[PDB]
Amino acid sequence: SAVKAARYGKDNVRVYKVHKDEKTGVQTVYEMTVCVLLEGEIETSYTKADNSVIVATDSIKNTIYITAKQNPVTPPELFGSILGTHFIEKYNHIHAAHVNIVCHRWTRMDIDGKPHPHSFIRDSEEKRNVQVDVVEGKGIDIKSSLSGLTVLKSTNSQFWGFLRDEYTTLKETWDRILSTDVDATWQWKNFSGLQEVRSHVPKFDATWATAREVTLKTFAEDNSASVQATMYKMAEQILARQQLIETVEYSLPNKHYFEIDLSWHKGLQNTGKNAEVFAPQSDPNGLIKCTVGRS
Amino acid sequence: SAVKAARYGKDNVRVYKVHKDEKTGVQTVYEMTVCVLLEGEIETSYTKADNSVIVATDSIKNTIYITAKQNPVTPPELFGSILGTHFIEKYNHIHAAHVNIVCHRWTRMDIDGKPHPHSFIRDSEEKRNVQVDVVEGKGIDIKSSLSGLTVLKSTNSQFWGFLRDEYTTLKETWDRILSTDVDATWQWKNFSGLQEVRSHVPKFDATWATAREVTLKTFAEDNSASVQATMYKMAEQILARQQLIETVEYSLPNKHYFEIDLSWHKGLQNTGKNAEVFAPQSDPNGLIKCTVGRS
Amino acid sequence: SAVKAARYGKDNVRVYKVHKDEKTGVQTVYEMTVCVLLEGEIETSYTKADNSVIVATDSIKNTIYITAKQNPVTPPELFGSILGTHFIEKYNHIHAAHVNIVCHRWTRMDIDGKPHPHSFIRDSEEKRNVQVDVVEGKGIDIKSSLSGLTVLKSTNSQFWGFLRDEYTTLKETWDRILSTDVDATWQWKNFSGLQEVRSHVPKFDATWATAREVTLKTFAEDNSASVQATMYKMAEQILARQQLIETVEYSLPNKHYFEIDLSWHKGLQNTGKNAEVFAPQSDPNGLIKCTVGRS
Amino acid sequence: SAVKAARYGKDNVRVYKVHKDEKTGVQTVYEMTVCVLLEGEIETSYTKADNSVIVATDSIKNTIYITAKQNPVTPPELFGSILGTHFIEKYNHIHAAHVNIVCHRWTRMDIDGKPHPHSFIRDSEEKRNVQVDVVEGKGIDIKSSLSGLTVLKSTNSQFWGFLRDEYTTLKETWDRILSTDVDATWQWKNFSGLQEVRSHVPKFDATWATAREVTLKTFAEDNSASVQATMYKMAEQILARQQLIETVEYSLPNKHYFEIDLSWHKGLQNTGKNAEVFAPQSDPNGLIKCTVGRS
Ligand SMILES: O=c1[nH]c(=O)c2nn[nH]c2[nH]1
Ligand SMILES: O=c1[nH]c(=O)c2nn[nH]c2[nH]1
Ligand SMILES: O=c1[nH]c(=O)c2nn[nH]c2[nH]1
Ligand SMILES: O=c1[nH]c(=O)c2nn[nH]c2[nH]1
Ligand SMILES: O=c1[nH]c(=O)c2nn[nH]c2[nH]1
Ligand SMILES: O=c1[nH]c(=O)c2nn[nH]c2[nH]1
Ligand SMILES: O=c1[nH]c(=O)c2nn[nH]c2[nH]1
Ligand SMILES: O=c1[nH]c(=O)c2nn[nH]c2[nH]1
Ligand code: NA
Ligand code: NA
Ligand code: NA
Ligand code: NA
């Protein structure tokens, strides 16, 4: 037997960084959770108890905290590129650094209508994430994503004309609730290294905001033929509004709201056009996935 | 042996209600999770397999869905009063109905700056809750609450002058991070019945909003002497801005952000006034509780 | 306004203790999560920023770790009595200590059929808990519990003869699945202080084991007339097999497994006596509660 | 733009199956959660609102319930092969079926030492899983796994001799706690189709049990040089005890138990060889991964 593949590192490193402006007196906070896994010439650590090759996970932990000290933590695409680059450059035998970041929202608190200088709220559990892969020779791969964007529309969704057979029981419909948790991942064209990432920084924060805008706009206005149809439209536009994206990937669960028929009770009319009260379903859920690139 | 106390019912009933305005074309959605437990003359169901006394939990489930059909679901204080009242009036042997509601945020989506008529986002995991207890003879007790309000301030919190002894190691401080998840519960003066609840309805939605405003304002501006000091101030004001509240209760966990000392590394200065990067702590957490009434 | 009630302390203190036998070479591990909240003359900490009265939560954290060092951590009833007593005796102004412990299972690993001396598995997420309340003057109140005992029986449960009305749709049944997560809490007669707890120690571990045995035996063999009927029987016996219990409390959710009718598909027969495949329901759930004492 | 990749289906389908032996009177229960995603010629459903190509997720839900009715649900490798095969054979335009199953433990209850015929306990949250990929032309790929196996050893783990530099602070050690949640995935050599799966069935249940045995045995007895070293040894043996495995993959988080130094308190000695009481750490965690094949 032999080691086909190996990576190791530190997961779930919670990190908080405060930037204190002395002019304005205005503080800004950033909170991340960071994962770093390294690959390279480390298989002897697995086969020959050879720890000489192991950069301790604790040191990787340390290094995250240092790198966040010595460098900006935002935008995460950059921070992850920095942190990843660090480990391949620092260590001869480490040939890949895989950095995952989840950004937790700390939104400035409005007080009577005045951005408070040092108070924030977690205004949503919506996450911004990156997956940065820094590989010796092959530059830097970046996947940016938003996840946990939970939305619903009460009408202006349909689903009709789907295969019917001895396994079908679902009734065609022209009016229904559509609700989903949006997972939207855009993959950047490979960068040569840290310099090229540094040059594209403004596009990171800017493209994230666009993915969100588009997801929400499209979800809202599209008289959805299906989840399939509506997710494709979102992906179309993110590609079209930013050239450096090679691929957009949506994963959308269909959180079903069933009709409750209460006609058995004093002929009470709650289905079809008289549908008011629905039983939101926890499980099961449709899951719909799409990857979209350039033709 | 004997039954000292007994309640039963249906938990985790997810409920969704849509209100379709035909003038404006504008839809509004409400989503709840509801629990109902009944008490009364039911001990034989426990001791003598006497199911004659059991209003099936399934029927209670049905009844929730019906009551939401036939009545407004908002504000929850009212819906819970209605749903509770129903069961004590309907059934001779049921002498108490305990209704718990959690309201899940569906905020109208802004699109280019125009309230969309039928699209919503779950803009926070912050919950509005009620606990309605409807007891034959003793009218209606209501506890309204907000929970899951996660906040943080980077400065303008202190904690000094606390007991020191052979068990103390914590260093006094004049500048620190304070972060908490706010649990704020206000208890209404007993109502006589459903009529009196119905007459106080405008105060429900209005008092909730005030509890939130006050929690956020006070948390922000107060140069906190302690969590104790700051939570008391919040409770003070909620009492003072609404007469029908008998008691305000805060429960606040202290989510600690530890300083990371990186001086061992190239003399890097990250503590005291040079604190930038902190390790948010998952556990343990201070937990601080206060109930405040009228003197 | 005024402080009606106040408690504070440290929550979620994870604690691990190893006992190294030097004769046998055999190690034993205990892992807890501990919460301590104190009451007493502390209201000035809330009203007058008077921190002099606050035993820092950090020190309480320290004290837990010390007390576990200097004392046995098992059984939890005792550890909690010790830890609680400590704080009322040590501090003049602290008049109550509330200690909550959750014990996490570390079961010795069997290897070829030989208790390994230092390897363990978390063989279930079933928790043993205590709630110890140590109050100056009023001795020590103890509530012991088991929670998270997830069980199911495929048959030998029924539910018929329950109220039917214009809110009922549930069909009587003589054969069904019953599945629940067992919450069983037994309350000890008040102890005078730490000495009396110390004298009743053997009964703690011994009564816990009995509550479990009884819960499982009774759940299994009882042709349940209802959840009500079956939980009462369990409580009956725990009371009857240990004299120092004043009250037994069960909370049992009814995790429903619905029949799936597949007759619409090639006349496939899956209901009634031909029921094989069921859809386990996540929500809603019946919730059934009973407190049982001595008549 | 164009659809690079697409799959859709039903997730989180909870499924329960009872087998009633009429001879013995002995019932046996199986509970799964199932996910099915299909690929094939479905891109028009995304681009042209062409629902004709969509096998409704609801029908896929139905099909799972039927397939479990008409076929054995155990072992999951087989059930998943059956369920996957079904969809590629049934539908001309569906070219791949991806089936994920999680098996939830229902262990027969021992009562006085007699396997009860119809009562079971969820004796662990340890999961058995499969990932079955059924692709038109390319037969059936199966990944079997165990996850959520939470273990700990108090001693007989070490970690010394690892790279040290200006980022290192971790102290070498010869005695420490090692604790992890085991994720062990074994990948089967490709099968031609359902017949070949059917012929290898006895090996499925049998290889799972071996992966568990080996994981536990090796974890226990190995004086671990590192997590790396110990996971490799486990993988080695699973490969060596079953020929049809092509690759074994372990993912092991290192759940750290920190030493608490209590010397500041009455010179209390709790570090090094006097370590008794430790603070289990929730985060961060080392994460260690290895894939092992045949050289
Ligand atoms: O948008 C949808 N896509 C689907 O594939 C589907 N299946 N059931 N409902 C559905 N809705
Ligand atoms: O309201 C429902 N809609 C559905 O699509 C469905 N499928 N099974 N039961 C159902 N109920
Ligand atoms: O606000 C606080 N109150 C307390 O009681 C405490 N203890 N440690 N830190 C603290 N902060
Ligand atoms: O930064 C810290 N602050 C604290 O209050 C504390 N208590 N133990 N370790 C600690 N670290
Ligand atoms: O045991 C039960 N008790 C109940 O009260 C009930 N209601 N529906 N099913 C039930 N089962
Ligand atoms: O199988 C079912 N059993 C029930 O008790 C029930 N109640 N609503 N739908 C149901 N389905
Ligand atoms: O087994 C280990 N492997 C590692 O790579 C490591 N790093 N810190 N501790 C560790 N333990
Ligand atoms: O006890 C500890 N062990 C460690 O490996 C470590 N790393 N930071 N703090 C620590 N404490
Ligand atoms: Na390198
Ligand atoms: Na009544
Ligand atoms: Na005292
Ligand atoms: Na096909």
mmCIF file of C-alpha atoms in Angstrom, chain C residues 14-264:
data_model
loop_
_atom_site.group_PDB
_atom_site.id
_atom_site.type_symbol
_atom_site.label_atom_id
_atom_site.label_comp_id
_atom_site.label_asym_id
_atom_site.label_seq_id
_atom_site.Cartn_x
_atom_site.Cartn_y
_atom_site.Cartn_z
ATOM 1 C CA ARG C 14 -15.976 21.738 29.365
ATOM 2 C CA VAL C 15 -14.097 19.653 31.904
ATOM 3 C CA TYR C 16 -12.134 16.435 31.536
ATOM 4 C CA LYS C 17 -10.655 14.403 34.349
ATOM 5 C CA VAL C 18 -8.368 11.360 34.096
ATOM 6 C CA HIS C 19 -7.873 8.887 37.008
ATOM 7 C CA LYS C 20 -4.578 6.913 36.516
ATOM 8 C CA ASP C 21 -4.513 3.617 38.519
ATOM 9 C CA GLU C 22 -0.801 2.709 39.040
ATOM 10 C CA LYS C 23 -1.445 -0.878 40.259
ATOM 11 C CA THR C 24 -3.626 -1.996 37.325
ATOM 12 C CA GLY C 25 -2.076 0.556 34.865
ATOM 13 C CA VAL C 26 -5.757 1.234 34.031
ATOM 14 C CA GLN C 27 -6.851 4.827 33.165
ATOM 15 C CA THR C 28 -10.491 6.131 33.529
ATOM 16 C CA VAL C 29 -11.781 9.332 31.956
ATOM 17 C CA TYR C 30 -14.683 11.611 32.911
ATOM 18 C CA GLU C 31 -15.970 14.438 30.752
ATOM 19 C CA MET C 32 -18.612 16.958 31.883
ATOM 20 C CA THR C 33 -20.004 20.275 30.816
ATOM 21 C CA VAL C 34 -20.642 22.496 33.805
ATOM 22 C CA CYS C 35 -22.678 25.623 34.414
ATOM 23 C CA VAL C 36 -22.574 27.641 37.633
ATOM 24 C CA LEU C 37 -24.808 30.624 38.372
ATOM 25 C CA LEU C 38 -24.704 32.433 41.694
ATOM 26 C CA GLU C 39 -27.309 34.483 43.487
ATOM 27 C CA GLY C 40 -27.075 36.652 46.582
ATOM 28 C CA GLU C 41 -26.477 40.283 47.500
ATOM 29 C CA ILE C 42 -25.371 41.284 43.925
ATOM 30 C CA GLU C 43 -28.066 43.747 42.733
ATOM 31 C CA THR C 44 -25.666 46.786 43.111
ATOM 32 C CA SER C 45 -23.536 45.190 40.320
ATOM 33 C CA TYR C 46 -26.675 45.781 38.129
ATOM 34 C CA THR C 47 -27.859 49.211 39.496
ATOM 35 C CA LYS C 48 -24.665 51.029 40.727
ATOM 36 C CA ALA C 49 -21.883 49.548 38.544
ATOM 37 C CA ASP C 50 -20.673 47.997 41.833
ATOM 38 C CA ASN C 51 -18.360 45.180 40.674
ATOM 39 C CA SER C 52 -17.112 44.575 44.269
ATOM 40 C CA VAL C 53 -19.973 42.079 44.657
ATOM 41 C CA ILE C 54 -19.125 40.169 41.423
ATOM 42 C CA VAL C 55 -17.158 36.947 41.703
ATOM 43 C CA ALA C 56 -15.861 37.102 38.151
ATOM 44 C CA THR C 57 -17.253 34.413 35.850
ATOM 45 C CA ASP C 58 -13.638 33.640 34.942
ATOM 46 C CA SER C 59 -12.942 32.876 38.613
ATOM 47 C CA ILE C 60 -15.971 30.629 38.720
ATOM 48 C CA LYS C 61 -14.481 28.932 35.608
ATOM 49 C CA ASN C 62 -11.131 28.574 37.528
ATOM 50 C CA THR C 63 -13.003 27.276 40.606
ATOM 51 C CA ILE C 64 -14.701 24.509 38.576
ATOM 52 C CA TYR C 65 -11.352 23.323 37.200
ATOM 53 C CA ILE C 66 -9.823 23.470 40.751
ATOM 54 C CA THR C 67 -12.748 21.717 42.410
ATOM 55 C CA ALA C 68 -12.534 18.896 39.863
ATOM 56 C CA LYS C 69 -8.750 18.722 40.541
ATOM 57 C CA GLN C 70 -9.162 18.621 44.349
ATOM 58 C CA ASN C 71 -12.338 16.413 44.428
ATOM 59 C CA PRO C 72 -14.040 13.504 42.607
ATOM 60 C CA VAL C 73 -16.077 14.592 39.540
ATOM 61 C CA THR C 74 -18.295 11.560 39.813
ATOM 62 C CA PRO C 75 -21.048 11.061 40.591
ATOM 63 C CA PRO C 76 -22.253 14.485 39.326
ATOM 64 C CA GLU C 77 -24.825 14.861 42.094
ATOM 65 C CA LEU C 78 -21.900 14.953 44.508
ATOM 66 C CA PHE C 79 -19.537 17.039 42.413
ATOM 67 C CA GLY C 80 -22.326 19.619 41.963
ATOM 68 C CA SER C 81 -23.156 19.633 45.686
ATOM 69 C CA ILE C 82 -19.399 20.131 46.390
ATOM 70 C CA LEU C 83 -18.993 22.918 43.802
ATOM 71 C CA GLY C 84 -22.191 24.678 44.897
ATOM 72 C CA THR C 85 -21.452 24.426 48.636
ATOM 73 C CA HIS C 86 -17.988 25.898 47.929
ATOM 74 C CA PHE C 87 -19.359 29.244 46.701
ATOM 75 C CA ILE C 88 -21.961 29.829 49.448
ATOM 76 C CA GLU C 89 -19.369 28.981 52.190
ATOM 77 C CA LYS C 90 -16.522 30.889 50.563
ATOM 78 C CA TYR C 91 -18.449 34.170 49.951
ATOM 79 C CA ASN C 92 -20.591 35.899 52.615
ATOM 80 C CA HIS C 93 -22.799 37.709 50.033
ATOM 81 C CA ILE C 94 -23.445 34.668 47.754
ATOM 82 C CA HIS C 95 -26.539 32.916 49.125
ATOM 83 C CA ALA C 96 -27.265 30.393 46.306
ATOM 84 C CA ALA C 97 -25.157 28.355 43.872
ATOM 85 C CA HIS C 98 -26.898 26.680 40.902
ATOM 86 C CA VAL C 99 -24.854 23.995 39.260
ATOM 87 C CA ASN C 100 -25.820 22.169 36.069
ATOM 88 C CA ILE C 101 -23.799 19.229 34.813
ATOM 89 C CA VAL C 102 -24.113 17.213 31.661
ATOM 90 C CA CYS C 103 -22.070 14.009 31.554
ATOM 91 C CA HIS C 104 -20.810 12.820 28.170
ATOM 92 C CA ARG C 105 -20.398 8.997 27.790
ATOM 93 C CA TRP C 106 -16.811 7.690 27.516
ATOM 94 C CA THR C 107 -17.309 3.934 27.486
ATOM 95 C CA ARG C 108 -14.199 1.640 27.784
ATOM 96 C CA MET C 109 -13.451 0.008 24.390
ATOM 97 C CA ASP C 110 -13.787 -3.818 24.182
ATOM 98 C CA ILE C 111 -10.869 -5.261 22.087
ATOM 99 C CA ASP C 112 -11.335 -8.976 21.145
ATOM 100 C CA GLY C 113 -13.262 -9.054 24.481
ATOM 101 C CA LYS C 114 -10.838 -7.324 26.899
ATOM 102 C CA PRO C 115 -11.603 -3.912 28.504
ATOM 103 C CA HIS C 116 -8.767 -1.784 27.073
ATOM 104 C CA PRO C 117 -7.091 0.228 29.851
ATOM 105 C CA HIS C 118 -7.087 3.705 28.144
ATOM 106 C CA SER C 119 -9.299 3.725 25.067
ATOM 107 C CA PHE C 120 -12.921 4.812 24.938
ATOM 108 C CA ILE C 121 -15.775 5.403 22.552
ATOM 109 C CA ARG C 122 -18.716 7.851 22.750
ATOM 110 C CA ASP C 123 -21.136 4.921 22.455
ATOM 111 C CA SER C 124 -24.317 7.144 22.476
ATOM 112 C CA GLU C 125 -25.344 10.875 22.631
ATOM 113 C CA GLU C 126 -27.566 9.900 25.608
ATOM 114 C CA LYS C 127 -26.732 12.362 28.447
ATOM 115 C CA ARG C 128 -26.777 11.967 32.218
ATOM 116 C CA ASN C 129 -27.493 15.381 33.859
ATOM 117 C CA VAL C 130 -27.899 16.909 37.294
ATOM 118 C CA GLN C 131 -29.298 20.221 38.459
ATOM 119 C CA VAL C 132 -27.912 21.023 41.930
ATOM 120 C CA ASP C 133 -29.240 24.024 43.818
ATOM 121 C CA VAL C 134 -27.275 24.959 46.929
ATOM 122 C CA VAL C 135 -29.088 27.626 48.962
ATOM 123 C CA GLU C 136 -27.821 29.139 52.259
ATOM 124 C CA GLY C 137 -30.266 27.895 54.914
ATOM 125 C CA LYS C 138 -32.248 25.494 52.697
ATOM 126 C CA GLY C 139 -29.613 22.772 52.124
ATOM 127 C CA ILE C 140 -29.272 21.090 48.684
ATOM 128 C CA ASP C 141 -31.906 20.333 46.027
ATOM 129 C CA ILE C 142 -30.935 17.766 43.391
ATOM 130 C CA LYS C 143 -32.622 16.851 40.128
ATOM 131 C CA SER C 144 -31.023 13.944 38.312
ATOM 132 C CA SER C 145 -31.953 13.115 34.752
ATOM 133 C CA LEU C 146 -31.272 11.079 31.677
ATOM 134 C CA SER C 147 -31.965 12.647 28.304
ATOM 135 C CA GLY C 148 -31.478 11.826 24.631
ATOM 136 C CA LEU C 149 -32.447 8.148 24.972
ATOM 137 C CA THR C 150 -33.815 7.526 21.531
ATOM 138 C CA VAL C 151 -35.909 4.411 21.195
ATOM 139 C CA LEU C 152 -38.433 2.776 18.898
ATOM 140 C CA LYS C 153 -40.749 -0.209 18.849
ATOM 141 C CA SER C 154 -42.280 -1.484 15.543
ATOM 142 C CA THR C 155 -45.453 -2.882 17.126
ATOM 143 C CA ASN C 156 -47.193 -3.380 20.513
ATOM 144 C CA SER C 157 -48.410 0.178 20.699
ATOM 145 C CA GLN C 158 -51.975 1.338 20.160
ATOM 146 C CA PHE C 159 -53.977 4.460 20.424
ATOM 147 C CA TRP C 160 -57.846 4.276 20.313
ATOM 148 C CA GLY C 161 -60.861 5.779 22.078
ATOM 149 C CA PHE C 162 -59.783 9.408 22.141
ATOM 150 C CA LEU C 163 -62.150 12.369 21.824
ATOM 151 C CA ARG C 164 -63.539 12.810 18.290
ATOM 152 C CA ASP C 165 -65.199 16.004 17.044
ATOM 153 C CA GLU C 166 -65.229 18.461 14.126
ATOM 154 C CA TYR C 167 -61.411 18.936 14.757
ATOM 155 C CA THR C 168 -60.571 15.187 14.634
ATOM 156 C CA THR C 169 -59.198 13.391 11.504
ATOM 157 C CA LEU C 170 -56.823 10.883 13.187
ATOM 158 C CA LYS C 171 -57.825 7.244 12.710
ATOM 159 C CA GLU C 172 -57.995 4.908 15.729
ATOM 160 C CA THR C 173 -55.346 2.154 15.547
ATOM 161 C CA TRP C 174 -54.490 -1.059 17.388
ATOM 162 C CA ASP C 175 -51.018 -1.424 15.788
ATOM 163 C CA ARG C 176 -48.534 1.408 15.249
ATOM 164 C CA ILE C 177 -44.921 2.476 15.686
ATOM 165 C CA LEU C 178 -44.026 4.343 18.813
ATOM 166 C CA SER C 179 -40.702 6.164 18.900
ATOM 167 C CA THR C 180 -39.495 8.786 21.370
ATOM 168 C CA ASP C 181 -36.539 10.569 22.901
ATOM 169 C CA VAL C 182 -36.726 9.969 26.599
ATOM 170 C CA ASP C 183 -36.344 12.745 29.103
ATOM 171 C CA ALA C 184 -36.636 11.347 32.652
ATOM 172 C CA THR C 185 -35.958 13.554 35.651
ATOM 173 C CA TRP C 186 -36.069 12.324 39.270
ATOM 174 C CA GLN C 187 -36.049 14.874 42.122
ATOM 175 C CA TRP C 188 -34.345 13.926 45.398
ATOM 176 C CA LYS C 189 -35.751 14.827 48.810
ATOM 177 C CA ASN C 190 -33.965 17.946 50.066
ATOM 178 C CA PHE C 191 -30.563 17.181 51.698
ATOM 179 C CA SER C 192 -29.369 19.221 54.778
ATOM 180 C CA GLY C 193 -25.917 19.845 53.257
ATOM 181 C CA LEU C 194 -22.822 18.261 51.786
ATOM 182 C CA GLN C 195 -22.491 15.587 54.552
ATOM 183 C CA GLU C 196 -25.923 14.131 53.795
ATOM 184 C CA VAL C 197 -25.184 14.128 50.024
ATOM 185 C CA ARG C 198 -21.861 12.337 50.750
ATOM 186 C CA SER C 199 -23.804 9.654 52.762
ATOM 187 C CA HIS C 200 -26.274 8.942 49.822
ATOM 188 C CA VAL C 201 -23.582 8.774 47.049
ATOM 189 C CA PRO C 202 -23.940 5.011 46.212
ATOM 190 C CA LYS C 203 -27.697 5.738 45.437
ATOM 191 C CA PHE C 204 -26.899 8.351 42.776
ATOM 192 C CA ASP C 205 -25.087 6.078 40.219
ATOM 193 C CA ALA C 206 -27.423 3.265 41.279
ATOM 194 C CA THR C 207 -30.717 5.167 40.790
ATOM 195 C CA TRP C 208 -29.622 6.553 37.422
ATOM 196 C CA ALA C 209 -29.004 2.996 36.154
ATOM 197 C CA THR C 210 -32.482 1.968 37.414
ATOM 198 C CA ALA C 211 -34.243 4.869 35.707
ATOM 199 C CA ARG C 212 -32.575 3.734 32.456
ATOM 200 C CA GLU C 213 -33.384 0.004 32.972
ATOM 201 C CA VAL C 214 -36.968 0.782 33.813
ATOM 202 C CA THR C 215 -37.451 3.214 30.944
ATOM 203 C CA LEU C 216 -36.180 0.635 28.467
ATOM 204 C CA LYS C 217 -37.923 -2.431 30.009
ATOM 205 C CA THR C 218 -41.269 -0.686 30.352
ATOM 206 C CA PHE C 219 -41.113 0.936 26.885
ATOM 207 C CA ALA C 220 -40.381 -2.482 25.305
ATOM 208 C CA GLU C 221 -42.928 -4.786 27.048
ATOM 209 C CA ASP C 222 -45.885 -2.450 27.690
ATOM 210 C CA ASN C 223 -48.638 -2.812 25.067
ATOM 211 C CA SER C 224 -48.953 0.927 25.225
ATOM 212 C CA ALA C 225 -52.500 2.218 25.464
ATOM 213 C CA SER C 226 -50.913 5.661 24.800
ATOM 214 C CA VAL C 227 -47.586 7.493 25.472
ATOM 215 C CA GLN C 228 -49.370 8.857 28.539
ATOM 216 C CA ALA C 229 -50.070 5.367 29.868
ATOM 217 C CA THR C 230 -46.583 4.075 29.197
ATOM 218 C CA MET C 231 -44.686 6.998 30.684
ATOM 219 C CA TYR C 232 -46.740 6.843 33.887
ATOM 220 C CA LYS C 233 -45.814 3.152 34.377
ATOM 221 C CA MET C 234 -42.059 4.007 34.090
ATOM 222 C CA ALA C 235 -42.394 6.807 36.700
ATOM 223 C CA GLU C 236 -44.389 4.534 39.052
ATOM 224 C CA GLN C 237 -41.520 2.053 39.245
ATOM 225 C CA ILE C 238 -38.643 4.513 39.675
ATOM 226 C CA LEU C 239 -40.493 5.990 42.662
ATOM 227 C CA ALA C 240 -41.155 2.499 44.027
ATOM 228 C CA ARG C 241 -37.520 1.248 43.698
ATOM 229 C CA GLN C 242 -35.903 4.263 45.482
ATOM 230 C CA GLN C 243 -37.368 5.890 48.594
ATOM 231 C CA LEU C 244 -35.410 9.151 48.534
ATOM 232 C CA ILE C 245 -37.028 10.217 45.214
ATOM 233 C CA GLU C 246 -39.888 12.615 45.856
ATOM 234 C CA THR C 247 -40.941 13.036 42.198
ATOM 235 C CA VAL C 248 -40.309 11.498 38.764
ATOM 236 C CA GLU C 249 -40.953 13.610 35.641
ATOM 237 C CA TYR C 250 -41.071 12.266 32.072
ATOM 238 C CA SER C 251 -41.155 14.355 28.918
ATOM 239 C CA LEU C 252 -41.676 12.252 25.771
ATOM 240 C CA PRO C 253 -42.060 13.545 22.237
ATOM 241 C CA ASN C 254 -44.034 11.300 19.914
ATOM 242 C CA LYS C 255 -41.901 10.944 16.757
ATOM 243 C CA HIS C 256 -44.523 9.906 14.247
ATOM 244 C CA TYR C 257 -43.937 7.386 11.436
ATOM 245 C CA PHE C 258 -46.664 7.922 8.840
ATOM 246 C CA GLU C 259 -47.986 5.176 6.615
ATOM 247 C CA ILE C 260 -47.255 5.653 2.897
ATOM 248 C CA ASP C 261 -50.123 4.480 0.670
ATOM 249 C CA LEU C 262 -48.669 3.239 -2.629
ATOM 250 C CA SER C 263 -51.917 1.698 -3.972
ATOM 251 C CA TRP C 264 -52.044 4.419 -6.749
#
